[PDB]
Amino acid sequence: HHHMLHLLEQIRAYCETCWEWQEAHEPGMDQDKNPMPAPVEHQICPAVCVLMKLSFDEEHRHAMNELGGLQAIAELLQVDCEMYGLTNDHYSITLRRYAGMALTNLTFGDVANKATLCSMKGCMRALVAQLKSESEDLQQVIASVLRNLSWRADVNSKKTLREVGSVKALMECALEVKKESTLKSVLSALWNLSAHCTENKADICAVDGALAFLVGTLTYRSQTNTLAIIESGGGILRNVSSLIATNEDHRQILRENNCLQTLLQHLKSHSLTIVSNACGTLWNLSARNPKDQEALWDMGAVSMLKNLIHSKHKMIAMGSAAALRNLMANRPAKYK
């Protein structure tokens, strides 16, 4: 794997030159006027491009991992982000994109690599900061890295992801994204993160406009006719619905956005994912709220849920039955 080794050595050499410059040019301190290393001077983008392309192959990933490729690529991304900040420079943007793509591929199904990357606190902070890049292509890439790291996150990783403020950053990112491809990656990342703990669920709900936005995603009609936005938006909503359920202000946001009506339509969807999400959301929203219970009764929710309790799918069978029994315990007068 001499060629791969050569590229990794090139990247490591460049990082060392950068770290040496950083050390000699500390904020507010005595410095000479020698300029920052520029990655173009060291042919960094082509090096990372080749590594990114190789990372699509599991045999090459094996070799890359033996050589500590993940750490080298993460170090490079971190140093470029620290040195140049949120630049619109094309060379820097593409190199960050390529590095992030390689990190996505190297974390796919890889328990050990996810843990290593999360352990790189400086790099995690740099990733989160990139969500404010004016490049939506870069945003897409960074959200995919975070999506992977959020899937089956161990105790340390969960803590790290929360400590670097990834939840608020991604939810705030989502409100601003203009490309569907970027939105898909961001919402997917939020979907995984929203499952970690109550605090992540609260942080999502606390972003001004986030709940109205998420209800909006439930009826988003894709430019490519896919269901990815409805699935992921509905997934986030399902995950955070246990907190919404106990918050009258948040329930009111859902009501003014016709959420219950939309969820009942989702119960009749042909998409397993969409039905599963809607069953979980209604499980929570059907609890402990006479207003929403009566609304669900009046809208014919009971008939719809009865048609789902015999599902062979555990989440649908569990969620539909739990929502049903919530409603049956609270029958409005006219349904006695």
Partner: peptide, 10 residues
């Protein structure tokens, strides 16, 4: 709770 697993780049 629900989730969507891992993804490959691009």
């Amino acid at each position: 709770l629900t989730g969507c697993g891992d993804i490959i780049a691009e």
